[PDB]
Design a protein around this nucleic acid. Structure first.
Lengths: 182, 55, 147, 327, 55, 135
RNA sequence: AAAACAGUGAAAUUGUGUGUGGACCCGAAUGGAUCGGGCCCGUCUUGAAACACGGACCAAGGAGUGCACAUACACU
């Protein structure tokens, strides 16, 4: 009995907002938006709201961007999608399904494409009007591991290591990967 | 030398090496303007530059 | 942040400036530059730079960059070279677009992905992969080789 | 949006004009400060010490065994200078630590896109009364902001020029500048920076007119063209909201220069006027909206008291009684 | 408009605070009466349990 | 001057008699004249004060900090604000329950007269009231 | 080599007068004898009060800086 009660408590506390974190930006429009979400969190247990509030506090690198096609790929049949970050255009795609994106920012070329295909962009202040009970929303996230600088982490002189050496490079010059597997 | 870096290669060994600064950049620009202007008076109706082919 | 105080300003009053009392801060305890690499620094090289001590490959005593410089595009990006207003005309229109990759500084076409719109297109370039040719011919398009 | 009234020499108003689109843009005091800091460093002149100062003399160490510290010393005879301590930074007349040098980086870069955006939102702030008052310009007597002087001002003399400015209500502002002159505190008063004055109105013109040389001798009046308007003039000291007298031609030109919202300027290629992450600073007030109040849950106000363990206080919370049973 | 709606919240919450407070005291008063009776029971059942052992 | 804040009048003496008179003199400032009295933390390898042997003096630290309510309070029961203009007193008009004014040293006689006249009518306590203007 | 104003005029150090003590610091006091605790700092060192070294006294000066090239983080 007790062991379950304990674990179910830990799982909850792992979701909820910390309330001793604050965004480092001196932008007063960004700090306004955080204040709203903070006052909502202390009056609710709903996991989507808590997740959103934690993400506004993370760094620029933690808020990695997504391309339009990848949002649709991760939307998994939902109508509204939410994203704490910036939405960029995909040059490989022209036609898209009708969709509503609530997000932090969008690029000029992406917004046009979204509009031509039918669909809307709303800023995160408006979420509560777009949705009544937060049942029809999906929440989506990028991954900072996909940066090109992650190819150099680790040691290239370990056995079976996939990492690349930091090297001078030319037509003949350059250190190779030699301890990997193929 | 410690840790992981691209191996150095910085060429500052030679003690006889000269440095060139560019503090004169705005002033020399103003002189080139004033020379063109006076040259343009000496041949007033005519353009300062000649016609050239396309290659 | 756009500005921050330095560490040196906090170390005023503390004896060793953060280099230790026993180890100290001497002039060059390990040697100058990247020297020592087959000897006392062998562990750094074998961990991070294993392909350093070697000679490799074919030699040409003079090379010309302009004669070998090239840039590559995939089939899935062909429609993307056009402006968005232009794309939206040719999508509905009865006419066939004629795209020349030379005009955007591309010389070779690769077979990555599927074409954005499944209607005919004429593509001009210097070289095509076998996959690219098959994909363009599949939609009733045409590949034209040119200098 | 609004109309604005033009003002003729005599103080009459009759013709009216629409207001440019730039004035609807929100203000970022972070970006104005950042841009000010960088640009202010581009007007510096280099300084350095002489390239081998402190190193002139013939000096050598005496080595150990003489009961003296092993600093280099001056080779001489016949003078009190013999045997004194020469080259080091801890010596009188020696060389300084890390001599200052001309190769330092004097200037600083800032992206063109930030420079354009900062100037746009500086212009915007010149028409919010809260900001203009906040800088310390006094505007109690001025009828409305912004001010737009007509063309067909035929003024040529300073005498008639001041009469015009007085009729626009600027008397108290101008007086505030004249009374301000004082000698600076510190060594700057020796290095050609002797007198300090408070900032006053900036006049912005675009077309060449006689009014420019009529007003310029009045203390605290400043002049610039609209096409090359600088952030040092628009946000002095990195605080925004300078008071501006527009000329009628110049005010109409703001539409060509900054364009219209979600369009591209023809005069500034590659630049467009953008959107913030939230529309206003007041968004915290959305909590009280109907849509939010349906979503949340009813609070509990009843809260537990802090633990007490003192003998007497505890005895009133838990009265103990003995038992005789031995079970 | 929202500045007016801010007042309706403050009023609504004061009513709720007074309400919950009144409901709390009644629970506290109820609990005190149950506790009196129960202590009399248990002090007697100890006495019974002891006699069972003597027997 | 013999004046007291009315809100603390029956308490001020308890407060005053409760304040510490401890001083934290620098170690060995009693031994050589070249070391001033101003506190610096000892950082020697052998030092008896850093190592906290019995019989060495005490070191500063957070434990000695006063309660938040009592802190900064002058012995008359007010907090102080500096003034140099007539237009400065205008700020105190809401705060005169807990704050009092102290005219800056460099303000001269002719100007001080104008400050004191305004202080009387607004009802603000000035603690340097006598000042230079006794003559 | 030194040496600016016929300004202001600190500390080391000296004389005279008036007070308090017998090297001095911390804690606690008397009308008054005093009571309790404390070895000289800085530094290398397993380990310093050391029969380890530097230090007669005061003022002023006196030691992680600039540029180039890759880099991880925070901010635009």
């Amino acid at each position: 009995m007790l062991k379950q009660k304990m674990f179910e408590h830990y799982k909850k506390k792992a979701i909820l907002f910390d309330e001793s974190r604050v965004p480092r930006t001196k932008n007063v429009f960004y700090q306004s938006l955080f204040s709203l979400y903070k006052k909502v969190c202390e009056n609710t247990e709903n996991e989507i709201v808590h997740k959103i509030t934690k993400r506004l506090t993370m760094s620029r690198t933690e808020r990695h961007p997504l391309k339009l096609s990848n949002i649709i790929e991760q939307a998994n049949g939902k109508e509204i999608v939410v994203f704490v970050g910036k939405v960029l255009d995909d040059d490989k795609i022209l036609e898209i399904p009708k969709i509503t994106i609530v997000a932090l920012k969008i690029s000029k070329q992406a917004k046009e494409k979204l509009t031509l295909n039918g669909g809307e962009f709303y800023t995160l202040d408006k979420l509560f009007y777009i949705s009544k009970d937060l049942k029809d929303v999906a929440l989506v996230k990028g991954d900072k591991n996909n940066r090109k600088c992650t190819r150099y982490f680790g040691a290239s002189g370990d056995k079976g290591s996939e990492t690349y050496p930091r090297t001078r490079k030319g037509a003949r010059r350059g250190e190779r990967r030699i301890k990997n597997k193929k | 030398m410690r840790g992981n870096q691209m191996l150095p290669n910085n060429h500052f060994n030679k003690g006889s090496m000269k440095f060139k600064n560019w503090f004169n950049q705005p002033m020399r620009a103003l002189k080139r303007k004033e020379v063109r202007e006076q040259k343009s008076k000496i041949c007033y109706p005519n353009p300062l530059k000649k016609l050239r082919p396309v290659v | 942040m756009f500005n921050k105080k330095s560490k040196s300003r906090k170390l005023r009053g503390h004896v060793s400036h953060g280099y230790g009392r026993v180890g100290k801060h001497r002039k060059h305890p390990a040697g100058r530059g990247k020297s020592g690499g087959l000897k006392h620094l062998r562990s750094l090289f074998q961990r991070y730079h294993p392909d350093h001590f070697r000679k490799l490959g074919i030699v040409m005593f003079h090379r010309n960059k302009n004669a070998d410089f090239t840039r590559t595009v995939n089939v899935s990006n062909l429609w993307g070279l056009m402006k968005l207003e232009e794309q939206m005309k040719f999508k509905s229109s009865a006419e066939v677009p004629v795209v020349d990759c030379r005009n955007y500084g591309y010389l070779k076409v690769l077979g990555g992905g599927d074409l954005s719109v499944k209607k005919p297109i004429v593509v001009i370039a210097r070289q095509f992969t076998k996959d690219a040719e098959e994909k363009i011919n599949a939609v009733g398009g045409k590949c034209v080789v040119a200098a | 949006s609004r109309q604005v009234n033009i003002i003729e020499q005599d103080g009459t108003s009759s013709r009216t004009t629409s207001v440019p689109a730039v004035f609807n843009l929100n203000v970022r005091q972070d970006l104005i400060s950042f841009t000010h800091k960088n640009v202010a460093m581009n007007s510096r002149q280099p300084y350095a010490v002489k390239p081998g100062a402190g190193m002139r003399h013939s000096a050598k160490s005496w080595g150990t065994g003489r009961a003296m510290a092993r600093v280099p010393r001056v080779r001489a005879g016949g003078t009190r200078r013999a045997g004194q301590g020469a080259n080091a930074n801890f010596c009188r007349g020696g060389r300084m630590f890390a001599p200052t040098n001309v190769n330092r980086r004097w200037n600083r870069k800032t992206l063109l896109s930030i420079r354009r955006y900062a100037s746009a939102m500086a212009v915007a702030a010149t028409s919010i009364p809260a900001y203009v008052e906040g800088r310390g310009h006094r505007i109690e007597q001025i009828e409305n902001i912004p001010l737009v002087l007509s063309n067909k001002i035929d003024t040529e003399k300073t005498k008639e020029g001041i009469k015009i400015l007085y009729n626009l209500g600027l008397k108290e502002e101008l007086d505030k500048v004249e009374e301000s002159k004082n000698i600076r505190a510190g060594k700057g008063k020796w290095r050609n920076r002797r007198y300090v004055l408070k900032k006053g109105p900036l006049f912005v013109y675009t077309s060449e007119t006689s009014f420019t040389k009529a007003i310029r001798n009045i203390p605290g009046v400043d002049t610039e063209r609209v096409e090359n308007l600088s952030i040092l003039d628009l946000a002095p000291g990195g605080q925004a909201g300078r008071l501006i007298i527009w000329m009628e031609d110049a005010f109409e030109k703001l539409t060509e220069i900054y364009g219209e919202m979600n369009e591209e300027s023809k005069f500034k290629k590659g630049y467009t006027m953008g959107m913030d992450v939230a529309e206003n600073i007041d968004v915290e007030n959305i909590f009280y909206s109907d849509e939010v109040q349906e979503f949340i849950d009813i609070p509990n106000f009843i809260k537990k008291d802090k633990m007490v363990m003192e003998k007497n206080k505890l005895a009133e919370i838990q009265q103990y009684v003995e038992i005789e049973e031995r079970i | 408009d929202l500045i007016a709606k801010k007042e309706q919240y403050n009023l609504r919450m004061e009513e709720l605070q007074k309400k919950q407070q009144e409901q709390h005291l009644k629970r506290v008063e109820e609990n005190k009466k149950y506790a009196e009776k129960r202590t009399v029971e248990l002090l007697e059942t100890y006495k019974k349990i002891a006699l069972e052992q003597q027997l | 001057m013999d004046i007291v804040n009315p809100s603390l009048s029956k308490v001020i003496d308890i407060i005053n008699k409760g304040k510490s008179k401890k001083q934290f003199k620098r170690f060995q400032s009693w031994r050589v004249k070249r070391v001033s009295e101003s506190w610096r933390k000892p950082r020697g390898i052998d030092n008896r004060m850093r190592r906290k042997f019995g019989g060495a003096p005490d070191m500063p630290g957070i434990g000695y900090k006063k309660p938040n309510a009592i802190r900064f309070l002058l012995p008359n029961g007010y907090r102080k604000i500096m003034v140099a203009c007539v237009k400065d007193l205008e700020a105190l008009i809401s705060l005169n329950s807990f704050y009092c004014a102290e005219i800056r040293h460099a303000v001269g006689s002719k100007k001080r007269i104008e400050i004191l006249e305004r202080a009387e009518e607004l009802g603000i306590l000035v603690i340097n009231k006598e000042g230079k203007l006794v003559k």
